[PDB]
PDB file of C-alpha atoms and ligand atoms in Angstrom:
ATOM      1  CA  UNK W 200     132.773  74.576 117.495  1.00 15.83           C
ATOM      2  CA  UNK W 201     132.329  78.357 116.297  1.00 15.96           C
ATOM      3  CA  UNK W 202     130.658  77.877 112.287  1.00 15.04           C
ATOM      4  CA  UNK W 203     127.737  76.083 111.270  1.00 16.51           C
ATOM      5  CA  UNK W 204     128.381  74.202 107.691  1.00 19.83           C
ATOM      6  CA  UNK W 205     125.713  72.339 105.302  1.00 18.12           C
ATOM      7  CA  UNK W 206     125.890  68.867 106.356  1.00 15.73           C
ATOM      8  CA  UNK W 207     125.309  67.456 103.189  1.00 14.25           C
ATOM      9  CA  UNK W 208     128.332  69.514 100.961  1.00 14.77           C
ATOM     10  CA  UNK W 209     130.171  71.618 103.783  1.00 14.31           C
ATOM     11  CA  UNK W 210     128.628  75.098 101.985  1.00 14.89           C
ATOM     12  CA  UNK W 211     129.597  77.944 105.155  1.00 16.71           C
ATOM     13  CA  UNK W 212     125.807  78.782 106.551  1.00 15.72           C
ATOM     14  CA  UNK W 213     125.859  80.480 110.091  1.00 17.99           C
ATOM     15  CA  UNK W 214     128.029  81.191 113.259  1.00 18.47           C
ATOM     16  CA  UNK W 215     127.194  80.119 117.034  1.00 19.13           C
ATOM     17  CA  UNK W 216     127.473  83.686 118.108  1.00 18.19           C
ATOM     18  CA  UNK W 217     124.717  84.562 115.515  1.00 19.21           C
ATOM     19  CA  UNK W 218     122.119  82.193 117.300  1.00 20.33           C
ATOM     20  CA  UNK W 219     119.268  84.521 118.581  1.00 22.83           C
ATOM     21  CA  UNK W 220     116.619  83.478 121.262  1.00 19.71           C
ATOM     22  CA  UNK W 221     113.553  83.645 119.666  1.00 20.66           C
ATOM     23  CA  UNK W 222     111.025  83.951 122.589  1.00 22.74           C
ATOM     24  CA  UNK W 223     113.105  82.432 124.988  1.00 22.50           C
ATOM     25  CA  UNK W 224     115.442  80.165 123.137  1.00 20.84           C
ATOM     26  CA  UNK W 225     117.534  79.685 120.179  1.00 20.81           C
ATOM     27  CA  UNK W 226     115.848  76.323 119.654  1.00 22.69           C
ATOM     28  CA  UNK W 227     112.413  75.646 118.217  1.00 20.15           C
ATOM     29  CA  UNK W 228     110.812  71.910 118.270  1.00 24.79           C
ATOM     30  CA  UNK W 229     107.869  72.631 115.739  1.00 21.62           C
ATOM     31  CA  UNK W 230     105.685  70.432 112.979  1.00 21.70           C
ATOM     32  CA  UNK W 231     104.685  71.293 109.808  1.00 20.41           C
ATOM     33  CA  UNK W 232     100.933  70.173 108.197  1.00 22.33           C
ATOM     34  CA  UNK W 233     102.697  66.938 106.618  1.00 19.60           C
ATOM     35  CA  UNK W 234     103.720  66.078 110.298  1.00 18.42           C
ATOM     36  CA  UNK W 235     107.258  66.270 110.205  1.00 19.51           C
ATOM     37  CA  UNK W 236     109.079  67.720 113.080  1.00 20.75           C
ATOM     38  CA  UNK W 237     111.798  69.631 112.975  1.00 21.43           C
ATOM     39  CA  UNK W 238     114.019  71.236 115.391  1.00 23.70           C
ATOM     40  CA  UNK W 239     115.011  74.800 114.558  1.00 27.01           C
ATOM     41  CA  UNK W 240     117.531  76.995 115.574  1.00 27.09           C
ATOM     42  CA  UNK W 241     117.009  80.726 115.148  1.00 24.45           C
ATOM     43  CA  UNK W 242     119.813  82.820 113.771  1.00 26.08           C
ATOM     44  CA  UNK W 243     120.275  86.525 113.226  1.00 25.92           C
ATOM     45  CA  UNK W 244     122.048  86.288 109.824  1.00 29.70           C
ATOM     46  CA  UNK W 245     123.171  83.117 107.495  1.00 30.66           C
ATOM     47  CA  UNK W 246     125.005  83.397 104.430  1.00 32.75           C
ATOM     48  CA  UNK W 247     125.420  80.769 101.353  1.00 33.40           C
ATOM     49  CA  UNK W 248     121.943  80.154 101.279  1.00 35.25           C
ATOM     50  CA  UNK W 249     119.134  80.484  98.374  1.00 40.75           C
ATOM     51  CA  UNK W 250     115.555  81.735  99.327  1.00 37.15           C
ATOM     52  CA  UNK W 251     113.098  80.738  96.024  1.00 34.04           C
ATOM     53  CA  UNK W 252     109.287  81.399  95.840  1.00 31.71           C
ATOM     54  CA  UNK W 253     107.755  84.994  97.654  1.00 34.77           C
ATOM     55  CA  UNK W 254     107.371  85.517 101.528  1.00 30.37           C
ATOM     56  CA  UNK W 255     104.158  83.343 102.921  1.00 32.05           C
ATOM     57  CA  UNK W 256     102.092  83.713 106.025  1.00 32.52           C
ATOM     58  CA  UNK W 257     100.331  80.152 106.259  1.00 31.20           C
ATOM     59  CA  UNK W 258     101.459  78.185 109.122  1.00 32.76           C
ATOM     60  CA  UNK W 259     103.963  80.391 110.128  1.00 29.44           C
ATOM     61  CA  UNK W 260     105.566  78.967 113.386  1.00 29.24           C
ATOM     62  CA  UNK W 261     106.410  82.723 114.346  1.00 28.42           C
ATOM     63  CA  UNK W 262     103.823  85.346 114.839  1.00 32.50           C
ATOM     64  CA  UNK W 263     104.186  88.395 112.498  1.00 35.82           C
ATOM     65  CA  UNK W 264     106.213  86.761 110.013  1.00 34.43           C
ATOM     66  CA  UNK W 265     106.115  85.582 106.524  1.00 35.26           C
ATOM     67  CA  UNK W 266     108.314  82.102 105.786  1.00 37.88           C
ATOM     68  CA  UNK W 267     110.577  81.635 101.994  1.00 39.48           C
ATOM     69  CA  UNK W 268     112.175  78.459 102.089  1.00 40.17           C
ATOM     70  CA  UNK W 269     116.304  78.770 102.193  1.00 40.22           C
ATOM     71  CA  UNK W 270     118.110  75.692 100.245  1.00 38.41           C
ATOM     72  CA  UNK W 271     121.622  75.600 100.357  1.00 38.17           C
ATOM     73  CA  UNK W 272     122.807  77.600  97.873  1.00 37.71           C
ATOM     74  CA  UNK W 273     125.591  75.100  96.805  1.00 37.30           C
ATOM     75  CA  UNK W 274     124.195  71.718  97.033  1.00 37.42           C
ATOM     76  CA  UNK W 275     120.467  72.684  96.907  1.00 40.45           C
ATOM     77  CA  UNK W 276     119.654  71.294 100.780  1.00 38.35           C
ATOM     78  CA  UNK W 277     116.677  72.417 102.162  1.00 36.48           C
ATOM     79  CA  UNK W 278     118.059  73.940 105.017  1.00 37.24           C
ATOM     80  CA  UNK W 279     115.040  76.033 106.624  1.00 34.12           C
ATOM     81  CA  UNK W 280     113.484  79.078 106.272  1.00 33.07           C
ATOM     82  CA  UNK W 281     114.051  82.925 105.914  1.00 33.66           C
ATOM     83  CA  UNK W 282     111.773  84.806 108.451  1.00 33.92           C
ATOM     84  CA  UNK W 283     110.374  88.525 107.545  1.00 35.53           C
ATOM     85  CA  UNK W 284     107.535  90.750 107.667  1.00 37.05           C
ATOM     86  CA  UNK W 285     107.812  91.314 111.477  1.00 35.91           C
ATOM     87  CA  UNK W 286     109.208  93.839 114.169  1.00 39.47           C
ATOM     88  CA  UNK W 287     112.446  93.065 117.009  1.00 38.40           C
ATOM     89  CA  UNK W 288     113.875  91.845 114.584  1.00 41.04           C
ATOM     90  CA  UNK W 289     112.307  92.299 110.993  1.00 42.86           C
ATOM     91  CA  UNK W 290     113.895  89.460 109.741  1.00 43.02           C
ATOM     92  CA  UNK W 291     115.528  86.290 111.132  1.00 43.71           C
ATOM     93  CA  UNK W 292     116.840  82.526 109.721  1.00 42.69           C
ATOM     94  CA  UNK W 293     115.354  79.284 111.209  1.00 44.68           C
ATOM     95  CA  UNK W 294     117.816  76.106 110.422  1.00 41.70           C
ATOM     96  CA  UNK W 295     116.776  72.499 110.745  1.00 42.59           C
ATOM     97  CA  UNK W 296     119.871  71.233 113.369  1.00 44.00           C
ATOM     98  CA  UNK W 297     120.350  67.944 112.107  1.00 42.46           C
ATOM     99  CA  UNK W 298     120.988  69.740 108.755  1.00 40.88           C
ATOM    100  CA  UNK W 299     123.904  71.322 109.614  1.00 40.63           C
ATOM    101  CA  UNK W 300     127.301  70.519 111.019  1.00 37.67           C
ATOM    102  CA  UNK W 301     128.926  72.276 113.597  1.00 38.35           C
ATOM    103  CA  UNK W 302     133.123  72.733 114.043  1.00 35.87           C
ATOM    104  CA  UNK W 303     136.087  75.108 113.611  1.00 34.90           C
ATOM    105  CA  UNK W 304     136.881  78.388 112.058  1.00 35.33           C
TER     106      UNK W 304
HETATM  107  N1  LIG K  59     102.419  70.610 102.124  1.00 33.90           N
HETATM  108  C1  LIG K  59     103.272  71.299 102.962  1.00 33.90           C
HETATM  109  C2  LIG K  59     104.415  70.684 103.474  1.00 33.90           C
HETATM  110  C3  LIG K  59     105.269  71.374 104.313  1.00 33.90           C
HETATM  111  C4  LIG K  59     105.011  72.703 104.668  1.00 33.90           C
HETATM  112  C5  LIG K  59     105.963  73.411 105.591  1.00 33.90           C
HETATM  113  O1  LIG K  59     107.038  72.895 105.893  1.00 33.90           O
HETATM  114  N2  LIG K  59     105.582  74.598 106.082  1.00 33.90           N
HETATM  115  C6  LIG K  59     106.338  75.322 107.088  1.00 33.90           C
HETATM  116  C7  LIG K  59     106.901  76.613 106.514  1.00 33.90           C
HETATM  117  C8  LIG K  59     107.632  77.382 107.606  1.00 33.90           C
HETATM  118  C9  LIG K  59     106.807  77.597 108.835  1.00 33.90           C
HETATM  119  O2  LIG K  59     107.007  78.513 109.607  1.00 33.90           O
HETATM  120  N3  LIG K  59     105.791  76.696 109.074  1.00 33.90           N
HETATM  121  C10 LIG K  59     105.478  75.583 108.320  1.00 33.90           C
HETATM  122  O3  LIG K  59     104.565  74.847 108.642  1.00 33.90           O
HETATM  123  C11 LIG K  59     103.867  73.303 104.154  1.00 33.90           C
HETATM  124 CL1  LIG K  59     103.463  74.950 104.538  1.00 33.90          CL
HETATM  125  C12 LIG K  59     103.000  72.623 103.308  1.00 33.90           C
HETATM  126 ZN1  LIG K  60     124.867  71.950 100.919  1.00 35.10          ZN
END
């Protein structure tokens, strides 16, 4: 249960050892303005993603940073969101969970 793949087409995203405690912890419960909840897990780095449209600042869920949404690059998921525009770190990933399928190397 080390790698994190795209539910949907099995696209390599993330590792467990790259989950970062954002605040406190590595998971975020959080709603958007259209009311959905998500639950988001914080990660240092992700790979096999795509991040379309610039950075934004409105209703950013983390303080300092500006959001671009990150689709799986390979099946075209929506997947979560590329964080930026802040300090400790400057940048960051938060995945949806249910989104994502952990298992082996
Ligand atoms: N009409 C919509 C429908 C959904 C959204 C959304 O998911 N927004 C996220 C972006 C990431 C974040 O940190 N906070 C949010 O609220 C937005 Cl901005 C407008
Ligand atoms: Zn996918």
């Amino acid at each position: 249960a080390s790698i994190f793949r795209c539910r949907q087409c099995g696209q390599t995203i993330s590792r467990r050892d790259w989950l970062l405690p954002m605040g406190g912890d590595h998971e975020h419960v959080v709603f958007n303005p259209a009311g959905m909840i998500f639950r988001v897990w914080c990660f240092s780095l992700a790979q096999g993603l795509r991040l379309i449209g610039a950075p934004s600042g409105e209703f950013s869920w983390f303080k300092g940073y500006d959001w671009t949404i990150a689709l799986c690059g390979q099946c075209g998921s929506h997947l979560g969101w590329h964080y930026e525009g802040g300090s400790q770190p400057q940048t960051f990933f938060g995945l949806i969970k249910d989104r994502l399928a952990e298992g082996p190397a």
